Ligand binder design. Structure first.
Ligand SMILES: NC(=O)c1ccc[n+]([C@@H]2O[C@H](COP(=O)([O-])OP(=O)(O)OC[C@H]3O[C@@H](n4cnc5c(N)ncnc54)[C@H](OP(=O)(O)O)[C@@H]3O)[C@@H](O)[C@H]2O)c1
Ligand SMILES: NC(=O)c1ccc[n+]([C@@H]2O[C@H](COP(=O)([O-])OP(=O)(O)OC[C@H]3O[C@@H](n4cnc5c(N)ncnc54)[C@H](OP(=O)(O)O)[C@@H]3O)[C@@H](O)[C@H]2O)c1
Ligand SMILES: NC(=O)c1ccc[n+]([C@@H]2O[C@H](COP(=O)([O-])OP(=O)(O)OC[C@H]3O[C@@H](n4cnc5c(N)ncnc54)[C@H](OP(=O)(O)O)[C@@H]3O)[C@@H](O)[C@H]2O)c1
Ligand SMILES: NC(=O)c1ccc[n+]([C@@H]2O[C@H](COP(=O)([O-])OP(=O)(O)OC[C@H]3O[C@@H](n4cnc5c(N)ncnc54)[C@H](OP(=O)(O)O)[C@@H]3O)[C@@H](O)[C@H]2O)c1
Ligand SMILES: Nc1nnc(NCc2cccs2)s1
Ligand SMILES: Nc1nnc(NCc2cccs2)s1
Ligand SMILES: Nc1nnc(NCc2cccs2)s1
Ligand SMILES: Nc1nnc(NCc2cccs2)s1
Lengths: 248, 241, 249, 247
């Protein structure tokens, strides 16, 4: 009777807040993870303590390669194995690091374009081929047109994800699958980043001079998958505190 | 007094009514603004006050641009403060819509099309902010703003100006904690060829579907969202010619 | 015969550079001005001294009012009275100043900021089209239209409206062979009013050379758009901003 | 000292026209090709007959693979070996075919994302590493109103927008400008029946025809010229208003 959702990169940070808030809403969840095995299992434990048999984990590398289609097929298949259905796909997993124009480059291309764009395409195809309020939500980037300097590949990946969001909204609408995006500006800052750099970014945000909580991002995801967004497809909701509006 | 309060312009019919109703159902007190639709405005106010008495008032004003528009807009915001003691939400919904081919005087067309669609929203936004917790404004935009209807230059200029206001006001009022966002319908309630162009189910949006996006944006679930415009268009804007 | 162009606010700065560059390419020019009468006449003189009977001036307030349509009709009429034709319209004139949401009356500011930046371009476009070869319109837009200066809401509304006009008019006049495009400076000639230190703050933002656009660089893009090399281009807005619009906060 | 330009996919159609018009402006050219050797060589011969030793050909597959970075480095190097310099890169080559959601899919990924996005990135990096310098990328005016069932193609073209913007921003301190030209409907497929061609043509507000190759080429010539010295990160539509037309 309960719908089911796949969330990629759901062990930590935003994806985890997404999976949690989906579960709170009624969904059974596949918690996809790559390296964060302890966190993934520990999230699924917490969720199944609340409602037994409502969470499973699924391990996969989302780097592009000739087995990526199979991995993506397996993420979707795992949702069907555990819950008999797959109502929502959340494309959240993401590699993020600089690739200056001036790891081999082909690995960087595989990681940054694979995770951020190719895996979402492949997951979207498998989601669709396996098929009610069906929908996909892609995690985009509010700053996609005012990119971080030296992040060409990352940015290319997120731009492609906009393209996917739109193309798949158009193509899947006849099957009643909605496809939308949520575009954070500055949400949870990289664990790697020092606290002076974190406040630099925080200070740019017109609304409150702080980053988005992961929960604030999830809230937008929840709206998009909900029955209050039934006529919404191809839309990318910025959740950025106005940051994208701010000139240099 | 702890129930928040909303002003919705053009609230007597169609999308504005639906927005007023849904806000009221969420627990808002509402100012139902109207220009010509007195009977309808009052009838809605009646229905809502039957649900919860003294939660709905009406306010008449022409939103055409003129020398008296700033005072009319200021009095709309005042009416919310008079009735309810606070003004938490402004929904800029009223809109004039008609062709103005490039090939009523043109200056009257400017006054109604740019006035109702952009200038009144600007003035209402100014009065709303001057008078000031989850404070927000929602502007009713247009999903087809960049693929406009042929011969609708002034309407389109006004809806583009409204994107501008949405973004400018979001930036400038963020320090006051006033969020400013937009909802952009495609084809909603018609004023069949059109229905068939929509990817998502070959139908128009109900007014309620538009309202749903407004309710989201005013909610505590959108507390970090400002300067965003959510399309509610069933994919129509994605469809090439 | 030589083609003819109208340039609004052409007495000084970017408008002058546009009129000059159009005249150098072979156009006869109407130099529209509002307050800058000495500068406009002085410009027409210089151009006429390079080639007789190729420049006139035309004074008009482009503030919105009930007479704005007549004024815009008269601008276009001036070009047909002077040159027997009107091939190109450059909507360059612009009022620019803050209008904080939180001096002049607000209705005056609306009239100036929406009138000059949007309404007069719409009426001029209407007149240009109705009074009718490579016919085109170029609207001076703003590359920062989606990252606006704080407290510039009416100016920004006007520049957004002008984007809309650009697109609506390109759509609607394409059947008549009239192209409509835009040119969108980021930081070009800074306000005369602005102190050097404030100017250098803006300059420092620009990735491409950390300087503002020259007036000539803006004009070059106008000249492309009116040219035979832009015959298939309509509804395009070209940023001339040295990458400024791409820079995050 | 004549400047030098690399044009990818320069043997035919839009790329050919770009190469010709660059050559007419005074550029020496590297005509890059994949399968169209005879057309590429005939263009080179034509251009050399006009001015000796001003055109060379360079064969390379721009599909993504382990060797694409070396291929892209070789293209750029061929310009320097032939002409002693490389002033302009035009990323024009493109694969284009439907990839419905409902060749292996990874080969589709390699061809569509490789030609349209990864190869321009690699080329751009090699161009920059080796340094009026500018790059022009051939984008798509319909990128936000895509053809149904062209997700991978559209993804590639959106990525190219991101490249164009990202490279503009990063390369601006080295004085390298990076821009795009976005055709709407230009030269239609070779096989497409006229009746199908006319459905597309009829959609275009400005003259109900597709853009010539030369018309697209004109915008590229503008962007590489001294008249665009402050233009970077700009994408000029050359679409006859098509992108403005609602469904
Ligand atoms: N945080 C922000 O400020 C911000 C800003 C703009 C956009 N976003 C977007 O919002 C989404 C969530 O953001 P976030 O900061 O929570 O992301 P994140 O923590 O940087 O990454 C989320 C997860 O992606 C997974 N991932 C990385 N490489 C992968 C690979 N090769 N295969 C499979 N999974 C891989 C990781 O899983 P394991 O941990 O299991 O390895 C990781 O925990 C992302 O799409 C991001 O680009 C975030
Ligand atoms: N329905 C759609 O397909 C669609 C598409 C795109 C955008 N939108 C936007 O969605 C919003 C609501 O759409 P709708 O179809 O419900 O609107 P609508 O029925 O065209 O107009 C709504 C109300 O605006 C008020 N209004 C019109 N001219 C006025 C004036 N001079 N002064 C004061 N009020 C005036 C009227 O109030 P009185 O009746 O009291 O005189 C009218 O009932 C609008 O902003 C519209 O532009 C709608
Ligand atoms: N300068 C920049 O950095 C920059 C940046 C972004 C966009 N732009 C745009 O590029 C264009 C040219 O810029 P600019 O700096 O050269 O412009 P500007 O000097 O601010 O103004 C140009 C001319 O506009 C005319 N004007 C102002 N108010 C008017 C009115 N009420 N009636 C008629 N004319 C009026 C004036 O004519 P008189 O002198 O005769 O009175 C003035 O000389 C403008 O459209 C502007 O918005 C410029
Ligand atoms: N034609 C249009 O209406 C239109 C519309 C929108 C955008 N565009 C863009 O404008 C540009 C030029 O258009 P077009 O119609 O002239 O292009 P096209 O004829 O489809 O492709 C141009 C060339 O791309 C090369 N190419 C294809 N796959 C390749 C690979 N794997 N490796 C290396 N080269 C490869 C081919 O070279 P060989 O022949 O040598 O094998 C081909 O001649 C493209 O970027 C296109 O996407 C065109
Ligand atoms: N996977 C990720 N995508 N984008 C991210 N943004 C992290 C930020 C870095 C600086 C401001 S936000 S993590
Ligand atoms: N007031 C109004 N603004 N925009 C409106 N759109 C109504 C249309 C719906 C479908 C084609 S036109 S009404
Ligand atoms: N009329 C005018 N519109 N925009 C102008 N730009 C002037 C600038 C002010 C700050 C940076 S550029 S003048
Ligand atoms: N490589 C190519 N990219 N885009 C192309 N477009 C050809 C067509 C344009 C419109 C219908 S088919 S070829």
């Amino acid at each position: 009777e309960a719908p089911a959702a796949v969330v990629t990169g759901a062990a930590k940070r935003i994806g985890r807040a997404i999976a949690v808030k989906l579960h709170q809403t009624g969904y059974r969840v596949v918690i996809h993870y790559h390296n964060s095995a302890e966190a993934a299992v520990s999230l699924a434990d917490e969720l199944n303590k609340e409602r037994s048999n409502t969470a499973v984990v699924c391990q996969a590398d989302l780097t592009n390669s000739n087995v990526l289609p199979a991995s993506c097929e397996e993420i979707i298949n795992s949702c069907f194995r555990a819950f008999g259905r797959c109502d929502v796909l959340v494309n959240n997993a993401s590699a993020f690091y600089p690739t200056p124009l001036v790891k081999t480059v082909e690995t960087q291309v595989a990681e940054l374009i694979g995770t951020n764009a190719i895996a979402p395409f492949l997951l979207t195809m498998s989601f669709a081929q396996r098929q009610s309020n069906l929908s996909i939500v892609n995690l985009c980037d509010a700053m996609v047109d005012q990119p971080c300097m030296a992040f060409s590949l990352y940015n290319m990946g997120k731009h492609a994800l906009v393209g996917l969001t739109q193309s798949a909204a158009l193509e899947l609408a006849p099957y009643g699958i909605r496809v939308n995006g949520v575009a954070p500006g500055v949400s949870l800052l990289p664990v790697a980043m020092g606290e002076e750099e974190k406040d630099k970014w925080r200070r740019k945000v017109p609304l409150g001079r702080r980053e988005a909580s992961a929960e604030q991002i999830a809230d937008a995801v929840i709206f998009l998958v909900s029955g209050s967004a039934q006529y919404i497809t191809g839309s990318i909701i910025k959740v950025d505190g106005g940051l994208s509006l701010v000139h240099a």
